[PDB]
Write a protein that binds this ligand. Structure first.
Ligand SMILES: CCCC[C@H]1CN2CCc3cc(OC)c(OC)cc3[C@@H]2C[C@@H]1N
Ligand SMILES: CCCC[C@H]1CN2CCc3cc(OC)c(OC)cc3[C@@H]2C[C@@H]1N
Ligand SMILES: *[C@@H]1O[C@H](CO)[C@@H](O)[C@H](O)[C@H]1NC(C)=O
Ligand SMILES: *[C@@H]1O[C@H](CO)[C@@H](O)[C@H](O)[C@H]1NC(C)=O
Ligand SMILES: *[C@@H]1O[C@H](CO)[C@@H](O)[C@H](O)[C@H]1NC(C)=O
Ligand SMILES: *[C@@H]1O[C@H](CO)[C@@H](O)[C@H](O)[C@H]1NC(C)=O
Ligand SMILES: *[C@@H]1O[C@H](CO)[C@@H](O)[C@H](O)[C@H]1NC(C)=O
Ligand SMILES: *[C@@H]1O[C@H](CO)[C@@H](O)[C@H](O)[C@H]1NC(C)=O
Ligand SMILES: *[C@@H]1O[C@H](CO)[C@@H](O)[C@H](O)[C@H]1NC(C)=O
Ligand SMILES: *[C@@H]1O[C@H](CO)[C@@H](O)[C@H](O)[C@H]1NC(C)=O
Lengths: 728, 728
């Protein structure tokens, strides 16, 4: 009798997850916005005050898009006129509000169209990027000092990243790193002069008579990539008219030998910086430890003090060399590295000593190091109950590595099995965030004795609303494939009955180091497919998937479009043979890597799938960017991996699509996986005389996330699946 | 007759129409290519021999695309390495083969990537265009003389047209016109400096890592058009030492005022050239008559023999100002003009005298003037039986305009109601070519006592094959709307039965001066829809259509997207009265203008139609080109016609589409109706939440005509109509 979770429920966000986003600002207080007052909370006692009144900025004259408060609390950055670029990059105007006064500063304002801004970690110093050059402000109302002069659109980038670096190396537009003193400003410079450009049309509003051509430096696989330089500027010694001096730190000879990348920047102490560098062949990376010299005024990186990571089995790190977490003095640090068994665990490194010491071990993996104090290192792993898709927070005592406590496993075992955490400064308190399988639960804690302080948001409101609807349930379990455990999940319709046969949709991603079977609670298309259409939606993590060691993750090294595709077919075969799935109605779908796999599956000739939907698929590894592709496939030269680059396109399997109903969708302004990719898929289908369905989304990019497009594509695919499954 | 006309038959051409394409080379011989042998024929007696054996160039090494034989029969041009540009333009390599000898010419060869070649009209001089400049050859083996030096790719065009001029004005690449002597070479020169560029992606073979951006100068409505200059060179007075002397002919002062076009160039005599010009507001045109001054060396155009044409109710001419046919002495010419009742007839003009004399009159129109001799003007009209969609050859005795014979009406009246003609030089012989309603029949005749000589091709073969197929029939008829006749044609399934209800597809074009209802015999898609799928396929010629005078044709002046659209809806309504149509299954489709109308109909909210298909549609007139659009729509400024430009888009009707099932298809490399036009439609249906189907064809242009793409779209449209009509 209750209503079912409908397509329109998902689309209009009728059942919302409540959140509790805070920003720790000290060792015992955080900022939180409530009824859009920016408040401060005292962690120990829960009491709150009003940092910045909701009312303030009513007469400001513009919609304020985000804010940032100076660390040593005398000012606040008001971000407005936000215009978005790529995944992380955006441009914006900024005002500055002086708090010890009811006043916006009116002089020496940060310019409009600013590319990036950042407070120093302490005090109130400002660093920004405009027209691709760096600028520094010592005080909010004074003139800025110009640090670089070489900035040029699409060509020279100072302190911000170019397209590849934003997307694949740093996951940020930013390329600035202040010292903990705020004395030193470090920045990377990127040169893209000889990097080719991907070009495409943007139509814009009807009123535009002629289409625009968007042109972006984008190094496709095996092209000339950008180069990078790294610099450091003393921010305390600057002159109103005399040009600032930037000291350059050079990459180690073992990288300058060829094409390479800056991969990580991390200050250790006020006088030591850590640089991780990675060879274009992503086999070899070097951590450089560089110290400031009182005498010379320069930075020396002792060769004997370098740290090396190699991989014989695949590439380095999960998507990148892991982050190093330094002890307070800067003499040692902790880092995730693959152990001799191939499982990623925490290793202890001392700076002028060579090997490192494993402090965690076993048939699971550490996912991230989240905080370090002199008594404790806190990390998240999937150790609990051997479930690779779970997540908990653990604690190690550094005086005995065997002394390990799990801090989150038993807090709410049935409801919470997927945590993330956010510690105050010095880790005096931590916010725990549970993401499923029940409703998300946010809690606060004290670290001295790991006591539960409160409950910050339990989503009770959601709970009450959901009780009135036929929600689906989720199964997490595993199958065996050739002596190995591989997990899967199913989203089962309500009042599921195993004596009936249900149509099955295989939801697939399957990119390297991905995980599609886990314990998090989601409200999404699948929810609707199952609750209203009684469709089983299934996902499976096969060879190539992550968090279960290298044997499985690297099985696909130098070989995309291979074991990961086979394994999705085999999982389906095995789902077929469960008494409850009708083998006449099995479909497959996915987005991005997911579309490539889905396409490669549909073109395999397996006979197992009736129909599928590929959204924004890669169709040919030579079409995608250099950093991601080569990491998994090497270079597409005959000397290296050209044959497989050629044997693993969707075009080559064009003939087999005659055996299936295929819907191909792609947005036309996709700057990440270019429309070209699906354009070649269709040309290939056409050359061979195969019918299929298509949908381009004008001006949409890789996420197809504009509100109306979003509603449309999911509307379009629901029609498609419904009809594939003879469902009215 | 048992078997059916099948989709594959259409697509694979199981049933070929034979043709008889001949090339006259004198008053009494023609050449004909049978197999690959070139044959020469005698028209009077009908004997024939082999001019060029198919074997001659077996060791040429390159596949020969076409040939052109010098008018004095001494040499032949071989065209190879043919690369297609737009509709008429293309590049190619050329060799010249000396006939009296059997020698290829090795000296001073025509260059690669040549853009246009043409023999003089009498002898064997050559004029070609390479890198946008004109070169002349007196003798095939001698060095060429460079006539222009200003040529610049995409900017200066000497002797060839820019994109608009090629497609909308001359319907040709060529912009060279030899004088009948061969003495003078007259050529146009276009300057596209300020014309904006349409840009679009072209993806090419799979192997291209980066898509190429194609950029073409193309004035969209109301943008900066190209400019034109006209020159005439004396080709008898060229030297190697001195440069060629080009004499410019300026346009009339009444054209120089504002923006204008060069519409027609026609040589009257060895020393007289006729030029027509047209004002950007294409409602006024001026014919200029220019003579060579033997002493001066110049060309003078006496403002006094200027002839003016103005239209009160609309534009000038059908798709342009009609062409003049000059009597041999040059002093007078005949030309089709709209008369005072609004019908297009032949008018006689004497060069220095006012007005002109109409030699034909009546409620019908002359379609073309086909030949002129001392005693007779030959022309084609649609007078016979008052059928606007019929065509016939007529003869008028010049010494008494009331003496008008129909030369074609009674030859084969039940089989032939649509002819075209081709006359030999001096018109002593003519080939008739009938196109329907029966199978095409090609016949040769002598002009003396308009006698039949021979039957050239009667398609007997095709006849018998077709006897064994259940072919559809064709109903050609009319409906009365106000006090006016509007013609439709129906394509009826075999064994038609006026008692049963058939589903109907309205096949629409409906752009200005178009005619969809006629007596032509066609084997096409509609053929299949009727014969195999038992679908009636109807076309209708309403307001804005042509060959019925101006009341009908100009009714849509400055109002595109109105009466032509309404009228198609009304036609389908009328078809429903007629009791053999199922009004729950009426559909509509079109290409180009047809696409535009279909989409405008589908969005009218009319309820009449269930579904439709739009291929390569214009969606906004500001997107299409300047010459065509401004012809019917004026300028898109507030002071001229901007409101209707904005009330006539497909985008604005978007909400209405929820009422129907729509399929939109467009080639990504359409340089004519830019993909932009459908990209904007798709985004508008998306912004308003209307579902629909789509299909882009990568790298195809406005014709989407490569064999595979053609097979695929028609396959895909078949599936669409079939399911729209609940037909298996
Ligand atoms: C064919 C399309 C594939 C697309 C992207 C997939 N994402 C998601 C996971 C991830 C996670 C990263 O750090 C955690 C990360 O750090 C660079 C990159 C990525 C990749 C980057 C790649 N751009
Ligand atoms: C909205 C798209 C429609 C575009 C095309 C329509 N055709 C058909 C009729 C026609 C007939 C002509 O001579 C008879 C002609 O001579 C230049 C041009 C045309 C136009 C050219 C214009 N390219
Ligand atoms: C919390 O309460 C204590 C006692 O009044 C006070 O000192 C503190 O400032 C309060 N904190 C906030 C952020 O309101
Ligand atoms: C402003 O803050 C008050 C104080 O609680 C809150 O109740 C009110 O709803 C907020 N007003 C706005 C602008 O949302
Ligand atoms: C930036 O923007 C505002 C309006 O957009 C303008 O008035 C101002 O002068 C510009 N310069 C600033 C604030 O840096
Ligand atoms: C960028 O590198 C190019 C070499 O491709 C060089 O010409 C240029 O000087 C470099 N610019 C800077 C500022 O490093
Ligand atoms: C036709 O016959 C005449 C007389 O035999 C011959 O001279 C002439 O060359 C022939 N022409 C052709 C093209 O066969
Ligand atoms: C044209 O190209 C072909 C191959 O490049 C060559 O044989 C010839 O010499 C070229 N130049 C000409 C024909 O003018
Ligand atoms: C073409 O037109 C441009 C723009 O008016 C002008 O400056 C240029 O000289 C012209 N070129 C020629 C060769 O006519
Ligand atoms: C020939 O004439 C053109 C312009 O008329 C000039 O640009 C070219 O250099 C000339 N060369 C000679 C041979 O006089």
């Amino acid at each position: 009798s209750r209503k079912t979770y409908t397509l329109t429920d998902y689309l209009k966000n009728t059942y919302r997850l409540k959140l509790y986003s805070l920003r720790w600002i000290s060792d015992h207080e955080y900022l939180y916005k409530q009824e859009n007052n920016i408040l401060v909370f005292n962690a120990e006692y829960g009491n709150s005050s009003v940092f910045l009144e909701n009312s303030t900025f009513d007469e400001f004259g513009h919609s304020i898009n985000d804010y940032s408060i100076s660390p040593d609390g005398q000012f606040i950055l008001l971000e407005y006129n936000y215009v978005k670029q790529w995944r992380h990059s955006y441009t914006a105007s900024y005002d500055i509000y002086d708090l010890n006064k009811r006043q916006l500063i009116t002089e020496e304002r940060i310019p409009n169209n600013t590319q990036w801004v950042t407070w120093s970690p302490v005090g109130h110093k400002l660093a920004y990027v405009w027209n691709n050059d760096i600028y520094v402000k010592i005080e909010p109302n004074l003139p800025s000092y110009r640090i670089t002069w070489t900035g040029k659109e699409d060509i020279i980038y100072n302190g911000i990243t170019d397209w590849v670096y934003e997307e694949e190396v740093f996951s940020a537009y930013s390329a600035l790193w202040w010292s903990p003193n705020g004395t030193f400003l470090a920045y990377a410079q990127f040169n893209d002069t000889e990097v080719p450009l991907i070009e495409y049309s943007f139509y814009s509003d009807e009123s535009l008579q002629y289409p625009k051509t968007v042109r972006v430096p984008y190094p496709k696989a095996g092209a000339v990539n950008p180069t990078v330089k790294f610099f450091v500027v003393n921010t305390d010694s600057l002159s109103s008219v005399t040009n600032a001096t930037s000291i350059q730190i050079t990459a180690p000879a073992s990288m300058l030998i060829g094409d390479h990348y800056l991969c990580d920047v991390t200050w250790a102490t006020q006088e030591r910086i850590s640089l991780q560098w990675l060879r274009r062949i992503q086999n070899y990376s070097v951590m450089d430890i560089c110290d400031y010299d009182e005498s010379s005024g320069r930075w020396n990186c002792l060769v004997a003090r370098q740290h090396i990571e190699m991989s014989t089995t695949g590439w380095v790190g999960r998507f990148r060399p892991s982050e190093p977490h330094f002890t307070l003095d800067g003499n040692s640090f902790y880092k995730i590295i693959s152990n001799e068994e191939g499982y990623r665990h925490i290793c202890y490194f001392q700076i002028d000593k060579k090997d490192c010491t494993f402090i965690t071990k076993g048939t699971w993996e550490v996912i991230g190091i989240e905080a370090l104090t002199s008594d404790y290192l806190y990390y998240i792993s999937n150790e609990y109950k051997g479930m690779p898709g779970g997540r908990n927070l653990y604690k190690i005592q550094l005086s005995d590595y065997t002394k390990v406590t799990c801090l989150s496993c038993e807090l709410n075992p049935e409801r919470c099995q997927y945590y993330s955490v956010s510690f105050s400064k010095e880790a005096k308190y931590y916010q725990l965030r549970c993401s499923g399988p029940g409703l998300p639960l946010y809690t606060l804690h004290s670290s001295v004795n790991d006591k539960g302080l409160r409950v910050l948001e339990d989503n009770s409101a959601l709970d009450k609303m959901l009780q009135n609807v036929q929600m689906p349930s989720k199964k997490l379990d595993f199958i065996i494939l050739n002596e190995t455990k591989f997990w899967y999940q199913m989203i089962l319709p309500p009042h599921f009955d195993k004596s009936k046969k249900y149509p099955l949709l295989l939801d697939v991603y399957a990119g390297p180091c991905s995980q599609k079977a886990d314990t998090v609670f989601r409200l999404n298309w699948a929810t609707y497919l199952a609750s209203t259409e009684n469709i089983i939606v299934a996902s499976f993590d096969g060879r190539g998937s992550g968090y279960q060691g290298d044997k499985i993750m690297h099985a696909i090294n130098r070989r995309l479009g291979t074991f990961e595709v086979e394994d999705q077919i085999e999982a389906a075969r095995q789902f077929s043979k469960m008494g409850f799935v009708d083998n006449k109605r099995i479909a497959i779908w996915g987005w991005s890597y997911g579309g490539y796999v889905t396409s490669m599956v549909l073109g395999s000739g397996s006979g197992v799938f009736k129909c599928g939907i590929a959204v924004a698929p890669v169709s040919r590894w030579e079409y995608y960017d250099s950093v991601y592709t080569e990491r998994y496939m090497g270079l597409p030269t005959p000397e290296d991996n050209l044959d497989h680059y050629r044997n693993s396109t969707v075009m080559s399997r064009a003939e087999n699509f005659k055996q299936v109903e295929y819907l191909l969708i792609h947005g036309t302004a996709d700057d990440n996986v270019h429309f070209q990719q699906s354009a070649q898929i269709s040309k290939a289908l056409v050359d061979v005389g195969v019918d299929f369905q298509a949908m381009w989304y004008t001006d949409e990019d890789h996420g197809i996330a504009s509100s109306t497009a979003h509603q449309h594509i999911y509307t379009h695919m629901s029609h498609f699946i419904k009809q594939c499954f003879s469902l009215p």
